[PDB]
Amino acid sequence: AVSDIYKPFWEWAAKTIKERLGDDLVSYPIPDGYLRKEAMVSLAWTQSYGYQTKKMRQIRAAHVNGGASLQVLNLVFFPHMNYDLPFLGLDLVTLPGGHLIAIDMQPLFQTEEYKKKYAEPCMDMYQKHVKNLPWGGDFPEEAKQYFSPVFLWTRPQEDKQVETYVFEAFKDYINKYLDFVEAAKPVTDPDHLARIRERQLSYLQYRAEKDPARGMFTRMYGPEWTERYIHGFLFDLEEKMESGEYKTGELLPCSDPLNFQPTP
Template identity: 45%
Template structure:
């Protein structure tokens, strides 16, 4: 059974059979030196249980949220979904405070019946702002070049989405089974740690910006979160599991709440 009755966003998420548990466990542990504090998440979104599939063969669905904040990070949150063969998902996003010139960290690790969809990026607040992007991409591109050669390309992203991704957007589709499992273990896992470690280094050295710069960064963050809320690809899946009212509230009030 998965953990029930979680009373705080900092309570550990433990879901039986969830493929992405080691990734979240690593991220939570890596954040500990930054002294994370609980982030306010309404109780009905901390952990939700449901079923999918047919009446004859129902499948249990668990959706859990882990979230924290720190002095330099407005919100760190993980949306975790386990629905057996139907879906297994970790959507992990770090939202920086607008008082620091930092990108977003984004990881989407998704298993569906037709394969794995996997994405990692340090996503820019303002892609056209060299002051914002230059110091990040200089360090990020070597990681991208290291790992992209080990993975099939995930294909093009829509033109409207391009302003919200860096040139180091690591995006792949891999098959289920032994081949995909091997790539997750030998490529996706170390790539996830490399991208996250770089982000944590950026946090450690980030210095406060002035009020003018802060307002500029906040406007970029608001554009990003509005776009992500509007285009969230999990909307259909979550609506099937829990209904549209719960799903829209989860997307707008928890996942992209800026």
């Protein structure tokens, strides 16, 4: 089977991020010791990528490769909390038991107004892709509040379906999301900002505590590295807020040159 089936996914996302965000794009600080992590399982490695703009607090990816039986691309766009933009969540998981694919613009709110603003303009795109990406099935209850009407949840059973149908939805959702980002305007109403902050923290807290990545990273690299990776990078909002680092709509200082390729 394809050993690194998400390498073409990442390469496309990197090219698109770089082109469409241009000079607004700067590196996001990747904590030392979490850029590249390797352990024997064959050699299995985790490669980190991180970026930010004045609208995107954090665009970060974990690309895990431990052979065909263990592949993950976890790519999430986190808006700054002075925007009501949804998250863009792209979880692509390949395990011995098959493929797991979760692609969504995870919403801050489930109101009629929010759905009209962000979900309804995506419905043709959703219906185009869901025809070849059937519903994946049973789904944890607590997570339901964090998914939109255009959630693509599917379990492809052949590599080819990932390389074709999933890849095309992957691209379309990223391009549509960045269209939203381009057009988004800041929120200045303090009441709305307070609610945006609450919903962002709720989502971040759920995934930091409940994401199945915790269990897998723990087996691979142990508990101490895993918790630092999860709370310190993958879902780091609460830490950055509590430490006084996060400032609404402001970039975190980082002088690292932009990187889009594996770092040995």
